[PDB]
Amino acid sequence: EQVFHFYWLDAYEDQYNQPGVVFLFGKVWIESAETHVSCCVMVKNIERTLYFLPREMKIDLNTGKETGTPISMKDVYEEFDEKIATKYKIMKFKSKPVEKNYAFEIPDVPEKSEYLEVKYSAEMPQLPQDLKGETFSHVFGTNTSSLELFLMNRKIKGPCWLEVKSPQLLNQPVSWC
Amino acid sequence: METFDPTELPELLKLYYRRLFPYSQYYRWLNYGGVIKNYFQHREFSFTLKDDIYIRYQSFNNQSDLEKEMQKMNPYKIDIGAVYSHRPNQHNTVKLGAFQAQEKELVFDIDMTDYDDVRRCCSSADICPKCWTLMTMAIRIIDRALKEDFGFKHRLWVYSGRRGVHCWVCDESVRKLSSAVRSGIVEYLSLVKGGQDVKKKVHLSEKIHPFIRKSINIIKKYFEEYALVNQDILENKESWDKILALVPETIHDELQQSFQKSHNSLQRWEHLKKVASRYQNNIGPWLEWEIMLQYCFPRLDINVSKGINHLLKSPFSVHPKTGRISVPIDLQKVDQFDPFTVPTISFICRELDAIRTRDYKKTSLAPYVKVFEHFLENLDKSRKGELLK
Amino acid sequence: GLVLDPKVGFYDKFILLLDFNSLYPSIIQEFNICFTTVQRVIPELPDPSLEMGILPREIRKLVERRKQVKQLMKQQDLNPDLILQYDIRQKALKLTANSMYGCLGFSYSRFYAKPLAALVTYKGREILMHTKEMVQKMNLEVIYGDTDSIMINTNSTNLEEVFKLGNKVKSEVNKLYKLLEIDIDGVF
Amino acid sequence: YPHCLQFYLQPPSENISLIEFENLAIDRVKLLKSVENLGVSYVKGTEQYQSKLESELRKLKFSYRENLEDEYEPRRRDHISHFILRLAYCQSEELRRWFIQQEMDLLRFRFSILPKDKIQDFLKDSQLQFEAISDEEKTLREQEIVASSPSLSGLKLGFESIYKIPFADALDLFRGRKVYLEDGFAYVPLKDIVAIILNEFRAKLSKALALTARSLP
Numbered sequence A: 001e002q003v004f005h006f007y008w009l010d011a012y013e014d015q016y017n018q019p020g021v022v023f024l025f026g027k028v029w030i031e032s033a034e035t036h037v038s039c040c041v042m043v044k045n046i047e048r049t050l051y052f053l054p055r056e057m058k059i060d061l062n063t064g065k066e067t068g069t070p071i072s073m074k075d076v077y078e079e080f081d082e083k084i085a086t087k088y089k090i091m092k093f094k095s096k097p098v099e100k101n102y103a104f105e106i107p108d109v110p111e112k113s114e115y116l117e118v119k120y121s122a123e124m125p126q127l128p129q130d131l132k133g134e135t136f137s138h139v140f141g142t143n144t145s146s147l148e149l150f151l152m153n154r155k156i157k158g159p160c161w162l163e164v165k166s167p168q169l170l171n172q173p174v175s176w177c
Numbered sequence B: 001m002e003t004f005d006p007t008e009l010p011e012l013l014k015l016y017y018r019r020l021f022p023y024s025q026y027y028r029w030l031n032y033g034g035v036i037k038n039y040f041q042h043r044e045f046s047f048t049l050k051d052d053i054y055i056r057y058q059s060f061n062n063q064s065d066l067e068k069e070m071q072k073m074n075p076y077k078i079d080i081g082a083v084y085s086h087r088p089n090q091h092n093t094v095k096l097g098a099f100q101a102q103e104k105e106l107v108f109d110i111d112m113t114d115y116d117d118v119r120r121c122c123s124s125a126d127i128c129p130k131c132w133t134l135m136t137m138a139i140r141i142i143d144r145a146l147k148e149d150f151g152f153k154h155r156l157w158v159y160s161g162r163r164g165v166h167c168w169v170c171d172e173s174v175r176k177l178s179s180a181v182r183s184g185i186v187e188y189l190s191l192v193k194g195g196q197d198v199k200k201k202v203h204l205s206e207k208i209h210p211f212i213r214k215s216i217n218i219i220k221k222y223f224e225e226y227a228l229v230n231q232d233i234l235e236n237k238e239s240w241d242k243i244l245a246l247v248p249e250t251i252h253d254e255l256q257q258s259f260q261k262s263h264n265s266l267q268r269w270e271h272l273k274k275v276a277s278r279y280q281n282n283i284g285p286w287l288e289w290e291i292m293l294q295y296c297f298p299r300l301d302i303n304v305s306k307g308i309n310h311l312l313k314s315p316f317s318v319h320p321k322t323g324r325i326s327v328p329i330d331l332q333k334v335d336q337f338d339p340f341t342v343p344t345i346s347f348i349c350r351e352l353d354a355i356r357t358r359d360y361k362k363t364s365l366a367p368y369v370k371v372f373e374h375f376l377e378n379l380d381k382s383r384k385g386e387l388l389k
Numbered sequence C: 001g002l003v004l005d006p007k008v009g010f011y012d013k014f015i016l017l018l019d020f021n022s023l024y025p026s027i028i029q030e031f032n033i034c035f036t037t038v039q040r041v042i043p044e045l046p047d048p049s050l051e052m053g054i055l056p057r058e059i060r061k062l063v064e065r066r067k068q069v070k071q072l073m074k075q076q077d078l079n080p081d082l083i084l085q086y087d088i089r090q091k092a093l094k095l096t097a098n099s100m101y102g103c104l105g106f107s108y109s110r111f112y113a114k115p116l117a118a119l120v121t122y123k124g125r126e127i128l129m130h131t132k133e134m135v136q137k138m139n140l141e142v143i144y145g146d147t148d149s150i151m152i153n154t155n156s157t158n159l160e161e162v163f164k165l166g167n168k169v170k171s172e173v174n175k176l177y178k179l180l181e182i183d184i185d186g187v188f
Numbered sequence D: 001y002p003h004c005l006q007f008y009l010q011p012p013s014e015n016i017s018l019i020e021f022e023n024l025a026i027d028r029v030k031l032l033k034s035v036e037n038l039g040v041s042y043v044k045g046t047e048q049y050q051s052k053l054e055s056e057l058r059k060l061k062f063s064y065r066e067n068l069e070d071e072y073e074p075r076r077r078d079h080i081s082h083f084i085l086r087l088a089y090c091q092s093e094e095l096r097r098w099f100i101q102q103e104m105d106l107l108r109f110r111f112s113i114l115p116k117d118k119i120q121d122f123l124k125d126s127q128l129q130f131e132a133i134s135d136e137e138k139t140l141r142e143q144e145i146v147a148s149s150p151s152l153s154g155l156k157l158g159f160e161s162i163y164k165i166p167f168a169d170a171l172d173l174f175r176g177r178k179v180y181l182e183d184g185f186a187y188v189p190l191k192d193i194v195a196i197i198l199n200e201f202r203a204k205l206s207k208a209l210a211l212t213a214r215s216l217p
């Protein structure tokens, strides 16, 4: 019913104080004034996304030897649900099995595999980079910033005209725009 | 009585794959005594399923998975490939360039389609006993060389199913040959330089290699029984025009005048021999042997043996067109092989129903199966003797 | 990085100095060097039967975009504003492509790959020594060359012959390779 | 006479003075440069070629009077010189081709000097396997070896020895039906044997030179 366009030039994010929110600054055309003016758009609720790489066999962390129990997506799912999420204070998340490639400088990773994709809110704590478990060997996407996620997910290639649907009004000003 | 029904194939194939296929011998052969770590888990199998479905990179862990995945799928055709560095069903895991074939048996094939200018008895789609000698003559021509010239000991000969034979050389030192060596081996055994319809395909010098001598010696025992009395290459003008097309130009007139006075094919062949010797004496390409070699020497294809990752028909399979089982050939009785007495899956089944699993002992497939473990048994003797001491 | 020691002295005749326009980006495109193609832990080059990788395919689009811009500027009787726009666009694509190797050899880069960088550099010094051999064979003297530039002494006094002589070196090097191209820079 | 032939392997682990380091390299360059000139100005099988090459080898002290096995002065000079001179010529491809080409003519010449009895010992000390046959077996298969031989005219089967080698190692000879084959073995005369030896040495030397340029920094 209402949609508004704006030409973004610069973007800002404050991970430490305001996690999961980004600011887009640009120019908006005005019919009444016959000229463009400054504009600020707040984008909220950007979710942390992580990828868990399962093992080919279950490894006992205490000794360092396999137990002969096959590993599936469901085993990683339950281990995350009952061991990791509770430990690191995570209330709500979303999990899905995905197929992904990898061709970079981390040893012992297949070039095509099934990963466990976990998305959750950015307000919740940040998992360690080197976190390891019984059912998963490695985790990717721990320290990815919100701005890069927003840029890659929506395919924004430099400055351009963006459409925002269902615009909302801020209660109190947050900018000099 | 009734016509052979190809549409009944799905019905018989099930009980064949449940109660008749030699899974144990298959595993023993393709495992090779379990000497190496993953010599069977790295082997590639190709299955041709319903609707010409072509799946290529398959692999299995051990025997039980093998039986389970042929009993749950029942392929129309089975092909065996090479062993790789990684599991064929797990090749997308590795980086592009690290998945490559390493070892494979040495495969030879001989087919009826290579004798289109030699058969005058049946068409391209027909075979008959009086030309099947062209297949047995080949078997003793090649098996000799691999046994004598190259010293290959373990060779398996299998019936292709309708119009040819396959040879599997499975010796330990043969499975690791480079592709260039296989190409050279095929070059050594190749004699007819058949191109795109070249007039002359066989050339000989004054000095003949011992291989050529032994090949001529073997052919001599069956030449008159097949070429002169069964094929009658000298019975019509167009028939002997083909042979005159290879003779030097100065001889045809004398050959025609000597042949017009003849009354039988044997006498014509003797006259040709005398004329050839007489022309030789004055002027030696050995005219007597080129037409003999051109008409009987087997023709091989380089592309089949050159490739280290080639996929070839597996033994103990079923031809979906004729129904004949790709059966091993007993090397002790080669000249007496009859392609028409090989039992079909339909033959044994109908009588049986009117009456760890070892149900095959009472079947008509069993006498041919005893050939297989004899090949299998000879392999452990080589392992036990040479390796352990 | 190979550097040829300059031939210090005074030169009377015309000197033709050339540039390697994207020497390193051309090697990535020539020999199919990528993250998903090179087998690594100096690594060995991939087989020529493989398909193009991710990284070489992105350098193709960058130089297939330049030629269309270059030929579109050849038209006459065109608006004065499009002349600048096409010229700016041409330079923007030129700058982006050249600095591609930097993401491979920069220690503080997010896509750092030591084996990958070493392989590109090693092939680079081979192309340099190969070019030097060709030039001295046609009775020309190389007085300097460093990885993006070559100075050639021609012993010529006719300027028309110098450019003709310069274009002959162009074809000689471009005969063996396909994508890397030299370009005239100036004359002293 | 002596065992001056070597497949250049296992680099030296010694240490030398700078003066010897320079002298060995200069002498080796001189020798290899004159081998090419002798090859251009003559042919490889004349008396002049052999005489001049041998006199030059005497002059530069690359084969001479004996010493206690290991510190045999000419052998040591030859080894160290070859491995020193690899570094100089590893850089360019034109230099690599020249070095490979000139280093094989010297090996051919040195193999042409060996007495008829030391060749077996050299071959056995070489890569893995070369074997000869006695006169009894040579006469047993004389006719078949003669028939299998190429189109060379006549039945002139002299006293030259015949060697049996695995068929794969004789690949370039057996794919054209130019050698006698019997149970995975080929019976070969001297000329094809030296051709095989030269080809193997060329392959190994090319591999070593390609590897050396990598670690030059």
Ligand SMILES: [Zn+2]
Binding pocket: B119, B121, B122, B126, B127, B128, B129, B130, B131, B132
């Ligand atoms: Zn027939």
